[PDB]
Ligand binder design. Structure first.
Ligand SMILES: COCCNC(=O)Nc1cc(F)c(Oc2ccnc3[nH]cc(-c4ccn(C(C)C)n4)c23)c(F)c1
Ligand SMILES: N[C@@H](CC(=O)O)C(=O)O
Length: 272
């Protein structure tokens, strides 16, 4: 119930509108997203309602909102390294298997938690996985997330970002939490190659082919271990009923043996 600029000292812009700020009472660094109150709020409202219901170390926290002048200030957990796709672009380097194993282990714990709560993220991609400066990965951008309920055991909205969308999401048939596991497999290729399969095709053409085409594979299979190859194959099983869960993939040899967040220390330092 206090004015936002007496609670927060706003520092630099982080994105275009998102700012770094200090919570003046604890010295904790936060991210503040500022949107005009007169803008289209549909996805911000959806996003904030999903984040408010989540309490996981693997999901970006929401701390609250304020009116300031004619803007809405949305206060969130600060992830100082930015997104995985920011880190790939900034270093001009794809991630090693070990870096990918460590990031995807934390991503999978975030998926396991969301899936237990009957949430589907629906936009899993390197752009939507943020790292804090200590190297802990967090799921962000709940703008298109779905909620299963007792009476609605499936969603059927064709939604997501085309290159990352599961075949059953593109097709008319309903789907459930394991749509995110397909998106995770595409994200694994994205982190290893810098872009998803079909990145150079028109998105609306790519969406037409994903349901009919075989599961994608690495562009240069000889670069990658049997474990990494098998991990991607399990993620990209076309049958949703047969596809591995987040819990099961946490035991996959590629993930189960991942190094701690220290292997991301070089990576984060170079990026920042
Ligand atoms: C030219 O290409 C682009 C350049 N890169 C670039 O803009 N990266 C970048 C990456 C970010 F993650 C980013 O946002 C954050 C940064 C730190 N900590 C955060 N905590 C929460 C967020 C965040 C930002 C936006 N959201 C909404 C989905 C509600 N949430 C956040 C941002 F503002 C910018
Ligand atoms: N990222 C900074 C610092 C570093 O590389 O350690 C430059 O470049």
């Amino acid at each position: 119930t206090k004015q936002p600029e007496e609670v927060f000292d706003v520092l630099e812009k982080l994105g275009e509108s998102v700012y770094k700020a200090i919570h003046k009472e604890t010295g904790q660094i936060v991210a503040i997203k500022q949107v005009p109150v007169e803008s289209d709020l549909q996805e911000i409202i959806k996003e904030i309602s999903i984040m408010q219901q989540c309490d996981s170390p693997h999901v970006v926290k929401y701390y609250g909102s304020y009116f300031k002048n004619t803007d809405l200030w949305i206060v969130m957990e600060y992830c100082g390294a930015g997104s995985v796709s920011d880190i790939i672009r900034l270093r001009n380097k794809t991630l090693t298997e070990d870096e990918i194993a460590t990031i995807l282990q934390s991503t999978l714990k975030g998926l396991e938690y969301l899936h237990f709560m009957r949430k589907i993220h629906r936009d899993i991609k390197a752009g939507n996985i943020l790292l804090n400066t200590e190297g802990h990965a967090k799921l962000a951008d709940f703008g298109v997330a779905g909620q299963l309920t007792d009476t609605m055991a499936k969603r059927n909205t064709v939604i997501g970002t085309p290159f990352w969308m599961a075949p059953e999401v593109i097709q008319e048939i309903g789907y459930n939490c394991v749509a995110d596991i397909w998106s995770l497999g595409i994200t694994a290729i994205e982190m290893a190659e810098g872009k998803p399969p079909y990145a150079d095709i028109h998105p609306m053409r790519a969406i037409f082919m994903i349901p009919t085409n075989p599961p994608p594979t690495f562009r240069k299979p000889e670069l990658w271990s049997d474990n990494f190859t098998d991990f991607v194959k399990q993620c990209l099983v076309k049958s949703p009923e047969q596809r591995a869960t987040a819990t099961q993939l946490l035991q996959h040899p590629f993930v189960r043996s991942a190094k701690g967040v220290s292997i991301l220390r070089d990576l984060i330092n170079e990026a920042m």
